[PDB]
Design an enzyme around this catalytic site. Structure first.
Site, PDB file in Angstrom:
ATOM      1  CG  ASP A  99      34.732  49.959  -0.515  1.00  0.00           C
ATOM      2  OD1 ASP A  99      33.538  50.286  -0.369  1.00  0.00           O
ATOM      3  OD2 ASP A  99      35.322  50.098  -1.610  1.00  0.00           O
TER       4      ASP A  99
ATOM      5  NE  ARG B 135      47.205  49.592   7.044  1.00  0.00           N
ATOM      6  CZ  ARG B 135      48.085  48.884   7.740  1.00  0.00           C
ATOM      7  NH1 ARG B 135      47.678  47.941   8.580  1.00  0.00           N
ATOM      8  NH2 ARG B 135      49.384  49.109   7.599  1.00  0.00           N
TER       9      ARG B 135
ATOM     10  CG  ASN C 151      32.156  53.576   5.186  1.00  0.00           C
ATOM     11  OD1 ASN C 151      32.087  54.562   4.449  1.00  0.00           O
ATOM     12  ND2 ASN C 151      32.468  52.352   4.778  1.00  0.00           N
TER      13      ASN C 151
ATOM     14  CB  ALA D 156      29.207  51.450   4.060  1.00  0.00           C
TER      15      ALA D 156
ATOM     16  CB  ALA E 289      23.776  53.269   7.158  1.00  0.00           C
TER      17      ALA E 289
ATOM     18  CB  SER F 125      23.271  46.582   4.133  1.00  0.00           C
ATOM     19  OG  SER F 125      24.261  46.705   3.136  1.00  0.00           O
TER      20      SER F 125
ATOM     21  NE  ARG G 225      40.423  49.217   9.258  1.00  0.00           N
ATOM     22  CZ  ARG G 225      41.287  49.004   8.288  1.00  0.00           C
ATOM     23  NH1 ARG G 225      40.884  48.793   7.039  1.00  0.00           N
ATOM     24  NH2 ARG G 225      42.590  49.004   8.559  1.00  0.00           N
TER      25      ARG G 225
HETATM   26  N1  LIG Z   1      26.153  45.038   5.159  1.00  0.00           N
HETATM   27  C1  LIG Z   1      26.250  44.803   6.468  1.00  0.00           C
HETATM   28  O1  LIG Z   1      25.314  44.383   7.150  1.00  0.00           O
HETATM   29  C2  LIG Z   1      27.634  45.105   7.055  1.00  0.00           C
HETATM   30  C3  LIG Z   1      28.215  44.254   8.180  1.00  0.00           C
HETATM   31  C4  LIG Z   1      29.515  44.622   8.503  1.00  0.00           C
HETATM   32  C5  LIG Z   1      30.073  45.854   8.188  1.00  0.00           C
HETATM   33  N2  LIG Z   1      29.584  46.552   7.080  1.00  0.00           N
HETATM   34  C6  LIG Z   1      30.311  47.657   6.444  1.00  0.00           C
HETATM   35  O2  LIG Z   1      31.632  47.235   6.090  1.00  0.00           O
HETATM   36  C7  LIG Z   1      32.298  48.484   5.831  1.00  0.00           C
HETATM   37  C8  LIG Z   1      33.778  48.203   5.608  1.00  0.00           C
HETATM   38  O3  LIG Z   1      33.907  47.396   4.420  1.00  0.00           O
HETATM   39  P1  LIG Z   1      35.180  46.434   4.238  1.00  0.00           P
HETATM   40  O4  LIG Z   1      35.990  46.995   3.111  1.00  0.00           O
HETATM   41  O5  LIG Z   1      35.862  46.274   5.552  1.00  0.00           O
HETATM   42  O6  LIG Z   1      34.619  45.028   3.740  1.00  0.00           O
HETATM   43  P2  LIG Z   1      33.440  44.101   4.288  1.00  0.00           P
HETATM   44  O7  LIG Z   1      33.795  42.673   4.063  1.00  0.00           O
HETATM   45  O8  LIG Z   1      33.010  44.498   5.650  1.00  0.00           O
HETATM   46  O9  LIG Z   1      32.247  44.477   3.260  1.00  0.00           O
HETATM   47  C9  LIG Z   1      32.108  45.860   2.917  1.00  0.00           C
HETATM   48  C10 LIG Z   1      31.217  46.020   1.682  1.00  0.00           C
HETATM   49  O10 LIG Z   1      30.688  47.344   1.715  1.00  0.00           O
HETATM   50  C11 LIG Z   1      31.302  48.110   0.683  1.00  0.00           C
HETATM   51  N3  LIG Z   1      31.650  49.434   1.227  1.00  0.00           N
HETATM   52  C12 LIG Z   1      32.523  49.730   2.177  1.00  0.00           C
HETATM   53  N4  LIG Z   1      32.445  51.040   2.421  1.00  0.00           N
HETATM   54  C13 LIG Z   1      31.528  51.572   1.621  1.00  0.00           C
HETATM   55  C14 LIG Z   1      31.003  52.841   1.410  1.00  0.00           C
HETATM   56  N5  LIG Z   1      31.412  53.867   2.146  1.00  0.00           N
HETATM   57  N6  LIG Z   1      30.065  53.014   0.467  1.00  0.00           N
HETATM   58  C15 LIG Z   1      29.628  52.005  -0.257  1.00  0.00           C
HETATM   59  N7  LIG Z   1      30.084  50.781  -0.084  1.00  0.00           N
HETATM   60  C16 LIG Z   1      31.022  50.539   0.837  1.00  0.00           C
HETATM   61  C17 LIG Z   1      32.539  47.353   0.223  1.00  0.00           C
HETATM   62  O11 LIG Z   1      32.761  47.601  -1.169  1.00  0.00           O
HETATM   63  C18 LIG Z   1      32.073  45.902   0.421  1.00  0.00           C
HETATM   64  O12 LIG Z   1      31.269  45.502  -0.691  1.00  0.00           O
HETATM   65  C19 LIG Z   1      31.985  49.255   7.106  1.00  0.00           C
HETATM   66  O13 LIG Z   1      32.069  50.662   6.839  1.00  0.00           O
HETATM   67  C20 LIG Z   1      30.507  48.874   7.340  1.00  0.00           C
HETATM   68  O14 LIG Z   1      29.689  49.945   6.836  1.00  0.00           O
HETATM   69  C21 LIG Z   1      28.354  46.167   6.529  1.00  0.00           C
END
Ligand SMILES: NC(=O)c1ccc[n+]([C@@H]2O[C@H](COP(=O)([O-])OP(=O)(O)OC[C@H]3O[C@@H](n4cnc5c(N)ncnc54)[C@H](O)[C@@H]3O)[C@@H](O)[C@H]2O)c1
Ligand SMILES: NC(=O)c1ccc[n+]([C@@H]2O[C@H](COP(=O)([O-])OP(=O)(O)OC[C@H]3O[C@@H](n4cnc5c(N)ncnc54)[C@H](O)[C@@H]3O)[C@@H](O)[C@H]2O)c1
Ligand SMILES: NC(=O)c1ccc[n+]([C@@H]2O[C@H](COP(=O)([O-])OP(=O)(O)OC[C@H]3O[C@@H](n4cnc5c(N)ncnc54)[C@H](O)[C@@H]3O)[C@@H](O)[C@H]2O)c1
Ligand SMILES: NC(=O)c1ccc[n+]([C@@H]2O[C@H](COP(=O)([O-])OP(=O)(O)OC[C@H]3O[C@@H](n4cnc5c(N)ncnc54)[C@H](O)[C@@H]3O)[C@@H](O)[C@H]2O)c1
EC number: 2.7.1.23
Lengths: 231, 231, 231, 231
Positions: free
Chosen positions: C14, C19, C88, C130, C132, C134, C188
Site C-alpha cells: 500500500d 510511493r 487515500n 484506510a 478513515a 479505522s 507520507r
Molecule cells: N489506522 C490508523 O489509525 C492510521 C495511522 C496512520 C496512517 N494510516 C493510513 O496509512 C495509509 C498508508 O499506509 P502505508 O502503506 O503507508 O502503511 P502504514 O504502516 O501506515 O499502515 C497502512 C495500513 O493501511 C492499509 N492501507 C493503506 N491504504 C489503504 C487503502 N486505501 N485501503 C485499505 N487499506 C489501506 C495498508 O495495507 C496497511 O495495512 C494512509 O493512507 C493512512 O490512511 C492509518
C-alpha cells in the site's frame, strides 16, 4: 430440580434459557443450561459432552454467581400500572407500522436524554452481548455490577451508550401526545406502555443464579462463539 | 491540606487534578478540586462558587469512594521493566511520526483480536469520559468497579469497546518485529515500550481517594460538563 | 513503464503504490500494481498470479477511471503557505507528544462543529478503507466522486463521519492560541501547520489514473482484503 | 401545479413532503415544500417567510436538481413479485412481536454481509440524515450520487455502513426458513417480503426533482435544524 427442553437444567438454547431462567429465578433455584446442537451464547455447554454435564450436576460440579437481572415497572402517575423482570433486558419499543417514538431517559432523576426512537434497551451485563450489542453496545463481562443503557435507533445527536452503577434509577418517559409503546423482556413477556406513562428500570431484589461448570473466563466463550479474529 | 494550581485542593483543570491527585496518590490523602472557568469534569466544585467550598475543607465535610484505579507494567517475558498507574486511563500509543502499530489484544490471557492501529486504551471508569470517549468508547458511571478497553484507531473489522470485570488482567503484546511504541498514564507519565513487549493492566489494589462535597447524582455532572442535548 | 518495489508497476505494498503512484502522479501515467503477500488493498493484482498480469502491461489491457483525489493547502489568512495532494486521505494530526488539538470544523465555509481531538481526517473515497475506516469512518465505493470527513478521536458529542459532495471545500481552522499541528498526505508527505492556520481541502482537479485489469465488482476486493464475515 | 397540505407545492412538513414527492416524481413534476410550523428537515422553507415563497414560485425562483431516489423490487425466484420506490429509503424490517430476521446483503452480486437483524436500510443521500442517520449512518450531502447501505440492529461483528456508487445492485436475501419481512418507503407504502424472497434495491430511472429557492449549502440546513454545537 426441573428441565425445560427443545436445580434447573435446560437442554436447548439461549431462547429456552431465558425461558428457563424466568422460573429458576422465580423459584430462587439456580438455572443450568446445555446447548442442543443450535449455537447460542448463554448455554454453558453443548449437547455433545453430555454425560459429564448431567453427572456434574449430580456430582455437584458448578457454582452460582449473582448475575445482574433487572426489574421493570411501568407506572401511571404515581400509580404503578405494570411490573416485570428480565435476565437479558427490558426492550422499550414502538409499534411496527408506526413511526418514531418520543421518549425521555432520566437516570437517578436527571433526564439524560430525550429523543424519537425505535425504543430503549436497558440491559444487564449478563445480556450485554445481545440486542444492546446489536445497538452498538459494548460487551459487558457477565460478572460486572452495572446497568446498560442503549437507545434503539434514536433520531438524536447523542445516543452514546451509558453504563451506570447497579443501584441507579433508569426512567423512560413516554410522551403523552404520542403512541402506546411496548415492552418485551428477553424476547417474551410483552406489556403495553401507554403514552403519558413512564418506564422505570432497576435492579431486581433477587438476582438469577448462574451455574458455572467450567470456571473459565468470559473471554473464552466470547471469542469462540462470536468468531473473533484474534489473529 | 495542599494547594495546586494550573486535604488536597487545586485551582486549575483536569490536568491539575491529575497533577495534584498524582502526588496525593502516594500520600493516601483524598483529592478535591475546583474547575477553572474552562470546562473541567472531575471538579466537584467550580471556579464560580469556590469560596463556599472552603467550608468542606475547613470542617472537612465530604466523603470518599475508592474509585477503581489501574496498575500497569510493561514486561518482556517475565521481566517487568516498568510500571505506571492511572486515574483516567492507560493509553498504549504508537510512535509519533510512525504508522499503524502491530497488535494482539488479550483479555483474561485470551487473545480477542489482532491488528494494526493508533493503539489501544485501557481505562478506569472515570477515564471513560476522557480519551476513551473521544476514541469511540462508552460512558461508564464513575463509581463503577470495572475496566474499559477501547482500541485506538484500529484498522479492524471489530474493535468494539470492552467493559471488563475489575477482577481481570488486560494485556496487549506489542510487535517485536516492528516499531517501539509509547505508553502514557493519565496522559502524563509517558513510558517507552520496547518492540515485542507485553502490556498488562489489572485492577489496582490502591484506589484513589475522593472528596465528594455535594452528594448529587452523576447525571448532573455528566449533563453540564458534557452539555447533553436533552433538547 | 516503471517498476517500484517495497505504465507504472510496483512489487510492494500500500505504501509502495502511494510511493509509486506518487511519482507517476506528476507523470500523468496510470498506476498499476501487485500486492506482496501481506494484505494490500489497492493492488488489482497479487503476489500469487503476478506473471499472468504482465500481459496487461505488455498488451496494455486495462482501463482508467479518474478517481477523485484531493488538494490541500494550509493558509494563514489569504497566504497559502503550503499545499499537498492525496490518494487515500489528508489527516490533520496534533503534535505527537502533545494533547488534544483545538478545532473548529467548517464545511461549505460553514462551521459544523468545534472541539479538541487527535485531529480530523479528510479522505478520498479510496482512502475511506484506510485511516478513515479505522478512525470510525464508513466504507465508500472507490469509484465514488465525493469527499469524506472523519474527525480523529474527537472529544465531542458528535463527530459523525461526513460524506461531502466533490464540488465542496472542506476547511479546518487550527487554534492559534494553542499548539502547532501536523498534516500528512497519504500518510507520507508530512507538513507543519502553524497554530491559527486554516486547513482547506477541495475536489482535486487532477484525479489519479487507474489501471484496472480484471473488471470484477469492488465487493470482491473489499471482501477478501477485509475478509468480511458473511458467516 | 398542485398542493398537498396539513410544479408541486407542499405546506406542512417532512412527512407530507415524502407524500408530496411520491406523485411529483410520478408526474415528473418538481416538488416544492414549505414548513407549516412543525420543524422538519426536507422543507426548503418555514411557514413564516411565505409570500416570497409563493411569489418566487410564480416569479419562477428555484431550480430542479436530480436527487437520487430509489427503486425497489421484491422477486420470487426469477419472478418479480413486487415493485416500489422511495425518496428517503426502502426499509427492510422484521415483524414487531417477532425475533431476529435472517438476511443477506449482496452488492453487485457479491454477498457482502449476512446477519440476523431488525432489518436493512438502503437510503438515498437525499435521505442520509434520517433513519440511516439513526442507525449510525454518515451524513450524505443531498447532491451526491451514491447508495447508502445501513443495517438495522444486526447481530453481527460487522455492520459498518457501506456507500456504493449510484449504479450498483443491492440485494437483501430473506431466509426461506424464516419469517415474512416488511418493506416501508419514506414511512409509507408497505409491501410484504415473503421468506425465501429476495429484496433488490437500485436507482430508479426517474430521479425526483428538488426545487431550491435558496441555492445555499446543505451545511446551512444541517447545522441549524440539528443544532450542531459548531462552537
Ligand atoms: N489506522 C490508523 O489509525 C492510521 C495511522 C496512520 C496512517 N494510516 C493510513 O496509512 C495509509 C498508508 O499506509 P502505508 O502503506 O503507508 O502503511 P502504514 O504502516 O501506515 O499502515 C497502512 C495500513 O493501511 C492499509 N492501507 C493503506 N491504504 C489503504 C487503502 N486505501 N485501503 C485499505 N487499506 C489501506 C495498508 O495495507 C496497511 O495495512 C494512509 O493512507 C493512512 O490512511 C492509518
Ligand atoms: N439483535 C436483534 O436485532 C435482536 C432481535 C430481537 C431480540 N434480540 C435478543 O434476542 C433475545 C431473544 O432471542 P429469541 O430466541 O427470541 O430469538 P431472536 O430471533 O429474537 O434472536 C435472538 C438471538 O440473540 C441470541 N441471544 C439471546 N439472548 C442473548 C444474550 N443475552 N446474549 C447473547 N445472545 C443472546 C439468541 O441466541 C439468538 O441468536 C432477546 O432477549 C434479545 O436480547 C435482539
Ligand atoms: N481526546 C483524545 O484523543 C486524547 C489525546 C490525548 C489524551 N487524552 C486525555 O487527556 C486526559 C488528560 O487531560 P489533560 O488535563 O492533561 O488535558 P489535555 O490537553 O490532554 O486534554 C484533556 C481534555 O479531556 C478532558 N478530561 C480530562 N480528564 C477527563 C475526564 N476524566 N473526564 C472527562 N473529561 C476529561 C479535559 O477537560 C480536556 O478537555 C487523559 O486522561 C486522556 O484521557 C485524550
Ligand atoms: N429514526 C427512527 O427511529 C425512524 C422511525 C421510522 C421512520 N424514520 C424516518 O422517518 C421518515 C418518515 O417520517 P414520519 O412522518 O413517518 O414520522 P416518524 O415518526 O417515522 O419520524 C420521522 C422523523 O424523521 C424526519 N424525517 C423524515 N424524513 C427525513 C429525511 N429524509 N431526512 C431527515 N429527516 C427526516 C421527520 O421529520 C420526523 O421527525 C421515514 O422516511 C424514515 O426515514 C426513522
Amino acid at each position: 430440580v426441573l428441565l425445560v427442553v427443545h436445580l434447573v437444567l435446560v437442554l436447548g438454547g439461549d431462547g429456552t434459557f431465558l425461558r428457563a431462567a424466568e422460573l429458576a429465578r422465580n423459584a430462587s433455584i439456580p438455572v443450568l443450561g446445555v446447548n442442543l446442537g443450535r449455537i447460542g451464547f448463554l448455554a454453558e455447554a453443548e449437547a455433545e459432552a453430555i454425560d459429564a454435564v448431567l453427572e456434574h450436576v449430580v456430582a455437584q460440579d458448578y457454582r452460582v454467581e449473582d448475575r445482574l437481572t433487572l426489574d421493570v415497572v411501568v407506572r401511571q402517575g404515581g400509580r404503578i400500572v405494570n411490573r416485570g423482570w428480565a435476565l437479558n433486558e427490558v426492550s422499550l419499543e414502538k409499534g411496527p407500522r408506526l413511526g418514531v417514538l418520543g421518549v425521555v431517559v432520566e437516570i437517578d432523576g436527571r433526564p439524560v436524554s430525550a429523543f424519537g426512537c425505535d425504543g430503549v434497551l436497558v440491559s444487564t451485563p449478563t445480556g450485554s452481548t445481545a440486542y444492546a450489542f446489536s445497538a452498538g453496545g459494548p460487551v459487558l463481562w457477565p460478572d460486572l455490577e452495572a446497568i446498560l443503557v442503549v437507545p434503539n435507533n434514536a433520531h438524536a445527536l447523542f445516543g452514546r451508550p451509558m453504563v451506570t452503577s447497579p443501584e441507579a434509577t433508569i426512567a423512560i418517559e413516554i410522551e403523552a401526545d404520542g403512541h402506546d409503546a411496548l415492552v418485551f423482556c428477553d424476547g417474551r413477556r410483552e406489556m403495553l406502555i401507554p403514552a403519558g406513562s413512564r418506564l422505570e428500570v432497576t435492579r431486581c431484589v433477587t438476582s438469577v443464579k448462574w451455574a458455572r461448570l467450567d470456571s473459565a473466563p468470559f473471554t473464552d466463550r466470547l471469542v469462540r462463539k462470536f468468531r473473533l479474529p484474534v489473529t
